[PDB]
Every structure is written in C-alpha cells, then in structure tokens.
Amino acid sequence: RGWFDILDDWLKRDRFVFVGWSGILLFPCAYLALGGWLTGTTFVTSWYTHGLASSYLEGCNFLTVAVSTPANSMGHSLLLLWGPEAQGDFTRWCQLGGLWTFIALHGAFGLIGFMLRQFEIARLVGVRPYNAIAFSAPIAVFVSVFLIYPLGQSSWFFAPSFGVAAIFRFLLFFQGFHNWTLNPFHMMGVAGVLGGALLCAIHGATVENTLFQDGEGASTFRAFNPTQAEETYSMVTANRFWSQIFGIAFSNKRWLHFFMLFVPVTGLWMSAIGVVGLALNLRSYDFISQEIRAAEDPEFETFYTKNLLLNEGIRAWMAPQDQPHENFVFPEEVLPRGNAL
Amino acid sequence: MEPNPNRQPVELNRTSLYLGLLLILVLALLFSSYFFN
Amino acid sequence: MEVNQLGLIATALFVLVPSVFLIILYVQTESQQ
C-alpha cells in the first residue's frame, strides 16, 4: 500500500473523463497545443515571418486565419521561449513564430499521450489494442508532414502553417514544386482514403438494408438491444445481394471489419513514406522518356507535358510572395504566360 | 534425437490467393510506368 | 520511346516472384484437404 499504488488507484478511477497515467502527458499537451492555436489565430500576426496578416485581430476570418511557420532565418531552431532567439521575451517569441514550434511539439507529445491512452484504457477493459494500432496512421502523417518534411528542407518555414487557407497553399505548393499528384505513394494514399470512405458508406448502408424485423414500428432503431447475442442484420442476404450485383461479396464478418481497419490505415502509411521522400526533394517529378521525345518532337503533347506547364506557372507566380526571404524579383518579361492571358 | 515438435503447417486459401494476386498485379500496373520511366 | 531497359526485368520479376510464392502456398493447401 505504497504511495505509488495510491496514485495508480486515483488515476484509474472510473469517472466522466478517465485520466490514467497517460493523462499526465496527454492532457497538458493536448490543451496547450489547442490553447496556442486558438490563442494565435485570434491575436497573433505573421507580419515579421511571412509578410502576412493572420489573426481575427488583424482582420482575417476563420478560413484565412493561421498560426504560421517561423521565418526561414530561424532554421530548424527549437525556438524555446527561454532560448537564444526570444531571450525570455514573450512578445518577441510570438512575433518570431515561437507558437508554431509550441503547437507542433505539444502536439507531437499529445499524440503520444493519446495513443498511450488507447493502450491504457484497452488494458484495463480487457480488449485487444487494435484502435491504438490504427492510430499509428495519423501519427505517421503528422510526424512526416510537420516534423520530418521541413527538417529535410532549409527550415521550419516550409512546413505547413496551422490554418485552413494556409494548408490550402501547402497543397498547391506541393503540386507546383514536387508534382506530388504524380507520386505513386500519394496515389496509394488516395486509394486508401477514398477506399475507406467507400467501405464506410457501403457497410453502413448494407447493414441498414439487411436488417431483421425485430420491432413492430417504422423506426428500425428501437428494435436493437445492446446485449442481444443475435445478430441484427442478415449476413446471408447481404452476401447474396452483393454476389449478384457485384460478383463478389464478403462472407466473413471478422475479415470484413479487419479490412475496414486495414485499408485506410495502410493508405495513410504509404503517403507518409512519400512525403518523407519529399523532405529531400526526391520527387517523382518527371518521366524521362517523355522529356527526351518532347524535346526532340514539338508535335508530341500529352497531359503529362501540359501539367508541367501549369507547375511552371505556379512556381514563378507564387514564389516571390510565398518565399519573401529569397528577394525574388521577376520582371514581367520573364514570367511564363500563354497567349492573351 | 527427436523430431522438432515445433513444426507447423502453412495455409493459404483461395480467397487469399485471389486477394494476393490482385494486390501484386495492381502494384505492378502502378509501379511499371516508373520502372520504365 | 527511350525507356529504362531494366524496367522490363524489374516489372517481370516484381510480378513473378511474389505471385509464385502465393501459388505455392495455395496448392499445397488444397492437397492437405
């Protein structure tokens, strides 16, 4: 009956929000990652790091508000408050992008906490830890896009800024500079996200239309009982339906639900790998065979060549404003433009 | 010296065969453009 | 098209090796039954 078990006891009591040993990491860090995003979107500028306005206080709305990345000059600096950059000054810290590293690191540690929470609750309740394993898919995405990718680059500046339109700019950046849509690791991500959404809709709709009639009334919801051993829809009528509409159908409920875990988890994992490549500018940007032919044969045109023209448009038109520290000056004559436009 | 008591048999059923083949053939179809480049 | 020549052996093996593994295990499964 030592103190350590007295605390174990209190941490693991059954209460409206379960706390746990993982709460100790999870809760401070999750509250702080979120307190900082709301703090910064409501009040803090990106004037000195990006030349952008970025808070409600400045005039932005919920789409254009963001906690933006630090200046390129900061490099990969941890940008601790008490560190050599902000020198203890809270005000300067905020103006240097200090809250970006704040959010990103408490974010990372909070995700750990959350996943440890899924391990902690599952051990106490006596279930298998597959919800925790699935959560590795989000973790991998987060660490690869927010930490690994800029650590490969010149600085934090080129990571995503935390905000709706700022993230939209990041999607276009990867098209113009990395040609990310052409990357097979992203394509596998797309097939997993959309495949997941497919699986989600189709399994929910099948169950809802293979239900047994267990009540008298027209709301079929009332007629479930959480404790009943009996299944509530017909796997037999579902299987025959889809075998005859689509040719194949599930026959095994365990494989079905495990496949719903597998498909979206794996696709996120594949896209994480791709973005890791892009940390290093290791893009699937070109097909060499295409370039050799088009260089030699000006009548040779495909959608592959058309899309790179567009990429070329994006790079030259967005770069000076998007990378202010490079003092890009592109006089009009050098800008790529088609006819009339 | 006795036979190893730890030996066990492997199974792959037909649905797993069909699933596995589709995975490889589709993987091949996607990566093949990149290998030829 | 001027294309990577090892692309062909790469694609052919990429298919044949894993595919053959799966077939081997299916067929010795049927023979058990």
Binding site: I248 | N13, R14, Y18, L22, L29 | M1, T11, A12
Partner: peptide
C-alpha cells in the same frame, strides 16, 4: 515492349476477375 507489358498486366487482371467471380470458394452456411 512497354506497351506489351502494360497490356499484359491489365489482361491478367481481367482473367483474375473471371476466376474470382465464377470460380470463387462458395460460401457455405453454418
């Protein structure tokens, strides 16, 4: 040779479809 390869893989997929549907392991009740 690229073309032959692309189309041979595609054609293998269509055959797998054929066997997956008509030569499936047939689901048996209980």
């Amino acid at each position: 040779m690229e073309t032959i390869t692309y189309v041979f893989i595609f054609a293998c997929i269509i055959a797998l479809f054929f066997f997956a549907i008509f030569f499936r392991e047939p689901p048996r009740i209980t």
